[PDB]
Design a protein around this nucleic acid. Sequence first.
DNA 1: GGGAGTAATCCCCTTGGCGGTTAAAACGCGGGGGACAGCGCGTACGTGCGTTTAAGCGGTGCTAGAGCTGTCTACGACCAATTGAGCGGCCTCGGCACCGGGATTCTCCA
DNA 2: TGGAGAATCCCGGTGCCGAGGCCGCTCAATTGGTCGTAGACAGCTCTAGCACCGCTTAAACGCACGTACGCGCTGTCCCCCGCGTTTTAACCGCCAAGGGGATTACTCCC
Lengths: 75, 72, 79, 98, 95, 105
Amino acid sequence: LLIRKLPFQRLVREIAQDFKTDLRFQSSAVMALQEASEAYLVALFEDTNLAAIHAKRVTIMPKDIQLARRIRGER
Amino acid sequence: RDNIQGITKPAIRRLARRGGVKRISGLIYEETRGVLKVFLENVIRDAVTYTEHAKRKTVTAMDVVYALKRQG
Amino acid sequence: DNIQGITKPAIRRLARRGGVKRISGLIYEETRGVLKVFLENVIRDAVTYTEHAKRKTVTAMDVVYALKRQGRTLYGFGG
Amino acid sequence: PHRYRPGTVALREIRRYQKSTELLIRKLPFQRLVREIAQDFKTDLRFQSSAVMALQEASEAYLVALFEDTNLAAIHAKRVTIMPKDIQLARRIRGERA
Amino acid sequence: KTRKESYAIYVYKVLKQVHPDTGISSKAMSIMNSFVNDVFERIAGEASRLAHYNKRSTITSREIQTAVRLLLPGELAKHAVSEGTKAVTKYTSAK
Amino acid sequence: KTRSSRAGLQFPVGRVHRLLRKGNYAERVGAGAPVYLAAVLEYLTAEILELAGNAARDNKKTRIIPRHLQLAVRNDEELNKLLGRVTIAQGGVLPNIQSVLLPKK
DNA sequence: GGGAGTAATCCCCTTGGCGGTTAAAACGCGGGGGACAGCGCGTACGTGCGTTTAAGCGGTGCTAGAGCTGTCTACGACCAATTGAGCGGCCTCGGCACCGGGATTCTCCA
DNA sequence: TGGAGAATCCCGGTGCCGAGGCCGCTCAATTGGTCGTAGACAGCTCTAGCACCGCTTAAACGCACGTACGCGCTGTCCCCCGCGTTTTAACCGCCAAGGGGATTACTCCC
């Protein structure tokens, strides 16, 4: 795994405390969340790399991020 | 509070190098933190309401895989 | 082949509806190719469902099902 | 002789076909095309008219969305014309082509 | 002629309940009918999935509430939940 | 007498209950479930017909055309989120020309 | 004495063809503005090294809450009567498409 | 720069066809009752989730520094747009053969 486990679990408890208080989690659930998030960011970075190579450049830019999300279908 | 700084710059660099990215600009990090926050908001809402249907107080892995199958 | 009936000004009108100003001369062949691929997939699904339903003529409701299976649902034809 | 600068007719045509709603591809060439494709899978199949109209509506919607994505990819590379590599990029980001 | 079931008179009644001085065409009628059928099918399928996941054999109002909260976004989901619970309370409390 | 008037709704409840039993969604079906589903369908119909009526008034017409439904769903954010993957027959597209395409003289 | 095989048909829609004709695709050519290649520069990014910090591993302690079993009671399946909402056929008149003339409003360039 | 000029909105008249009310049937929603079992609720067990502490050491932070390339400018040439003119097939309207599932009569058998 690339992202450290403990800051990721602090992040998921922080982002889930706004939806229901006094919530608990299973360890398999946060492992699945970390795996899904890493797969999502790997696929996103691959698509923004193709967007950057289309623009005759080797360094990726934030405009590549919005191009990949907009052509992908997200908002 | 402000736990989005735990997704650090070298971890983002490893995630970019896994996808084959050679060079990284300095404004990439604040955008990829935002897209990670948006994705986690969209999954954890479905996980919370799947837990709330079962009258439970623990988010199980089955709720997580159901929430991920909702998005595809 | 009847793919040449999808002519140059039709593709031009389709591009001008999308907000495209200037068009290169090699857009048209790739547009015909992707249209043929899309039509082949949809007609394959439609013929599959009208064969499993055991009639000799395919209808509009069958192709509404066909576009529904690809996540491309269409409103306004009895669906 | 009066002659417009090259681009005014383009925006006029863009506004005119963004206001309208009438179908752009003609009816009978699309009918010939759908018969020619459908005779390859199974033989002696017949068509309702509403199925042909539904196929026309689907084709119009898919090609308009594809041209919008192609236009965004063309503007991203500091260009105004659209090229086939923009189309390949647009289909590869959507995931239609492996 | 055979009998065909539609939602045409009901959406016409709702349209006159909302805007009294507006008509509607046949193509728009077909679009609204297909819209109601598709949303009904989606909510019914999601409620069936919630029924199967918790090992239950009955679809109740709680399953429809959870399917509405899953499928609808934003304030529209909250307003639809409020209208549905008001209708259920009015139906149950009636004589 | 009828259950739609008891619920105080306009959409039918018995028809929804029959469509729920016919679809084999579950072995059993509850009592307030078609009431809830009819209320939700009526409410979604209410906003889509509101926005279609406002578009039809703005276009100086007295009848709803598919173009007004297209313009109604593509300017509201939540309805465009809900109907993102759905296409409307005889609808057209929104007027949108990008900023760099304008003749900057 | 009633159920069943065979044929004509009244439609219902589909496919093929035949003539006119007319909008409309197709071909051609000037030329202008945009795609593409090359170069200069200066700043922002990768690499290296000291250094700090917090993740990870282990270990213990405690308890909320998942998970399973028992009992029963309210609630939904289901059947006969029945009757009012909801389907289909019919008729009409107003809203909207369209033609035509006119005033208004972008666009080019001297 | 303002007039020419071509496109575009606006207003009035025509007409035509489908949106929408009305009548009549009919069949599925509603009432009432019976019966079997699905899950509501309590209670018990005991797993695993959370809190806290301490040590170690790889990971990250911050800064110096070289230099690679992103971006702006300039030049070239070429290829697609605007418009005029020629050919062509979509379209409309009609006509006819015919596949096809339900609608009748005509006739036969246990």
